[PDB]
Amino acid sequence: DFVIVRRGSGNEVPDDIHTYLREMEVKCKPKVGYMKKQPDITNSMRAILVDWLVEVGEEYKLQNETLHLAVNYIDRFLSSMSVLRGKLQLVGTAAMLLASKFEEIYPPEVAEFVYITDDTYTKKQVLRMEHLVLKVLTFDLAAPTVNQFLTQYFLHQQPANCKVESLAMFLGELSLIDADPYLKYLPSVIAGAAFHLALYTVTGQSWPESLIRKTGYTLESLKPCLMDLHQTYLKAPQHAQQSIREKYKNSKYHGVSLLNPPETLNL
């Protein structure tokens, strides 16, 4: 088999790409409800950590794939490991370093992450946590993300729309902040609800039949995830984490965070 070597590694090599992602999203899934079993930290502390990683990604011009991978590493690590408040940010720093060295072409090194943490950790503390996360993750760094499923869904858009794609990615990142209602849904289901809600807002069209035959998810299958996602869109300006609404109000995303959300989804 012929394969091209490169720096980005969160890509499915030649094999139906969508069929491979569905089989892998189940494996290495974060244990839902670990935050209740977590003694020191809570969901509100995780939402702040994930929101701070969004600002780190925007500072170093990191891809959206690097952000979703870092959040996947945090939830899986915290599901089987107990971390304190002061070390929680160290876990997120090392997780962002792992996702950068795995997906980015020119990733920020350890000295860069020590710099952005205002010199509160050492080069060894980040490397130890990075090595600790690797051992906990059993070195399985390839994980399907909401960004990966959204890319596959866009190939079936007829026609394509820049506002729909940008709004879908905006809704996808909002699910990373709140772990209470979204950690129980699969990345393919979250991307499906984000694609429909974005398409319904911009154009009014619904979940296309081409995606029904390809994914098997019907509109009723996505209805539970679509309900929680519709409320976050309505309560987005009131949410305490606003680093994603500021990110998606730029010309690069056609300012989709400024679009008014629908009052009713008619579902």
| Residue ranges binding a copy of itself (CB under 8 A) | 2, 4-7, 41, 45, 48-49, 52, 55, 59, 85, 88-89, 105, 116-118, 120, 155-156, 158-162, 237-238, 242, 249, 251-252, 255, 257-260
Pull the structure tokens for residue 157: 């858009």
* Rounded least distance, CB 26 to a copy of itself, Å: 26
* Rounded least distance, CB 135 to a copy of itself, Å: 24
- Provide the 3-class DSSP secondary structure of residue 108: coil
Cβ nearer to a copy of itself, comparing 111 with 258: 258
Cβ nearer to a copy of itself, comparing 19 with 120: 120
Cβ nearer to a copy of itself, comparing 67 with 189: 67
Distances (CA, A) of 47 to 50, 52, 136: 5, 9, 22
Please check whether residue 152 is in contact with residue 17, taking contact to mean a CB–CB distance below 8 angstroms.
yes
CA 20-227-33 angle, 5° bins? 65
Cβ nearer to a copy of itself, comparing 161 with 221: 161
* Rounded least distance, CB 252 to a copy of itself, Å: 7
Please check whether residue 244 is in contact with residue 253, taking contact to mean a CB–CB distance below 8 angstroms.
no
* Rounded least distance, CB 4 to a copy of itself, Å: 5
- Provide the 3-class DSSP secondary structure of residue 88: helix
Residue 213: in which H helix or E strand, if any? Answer: helix 209-215
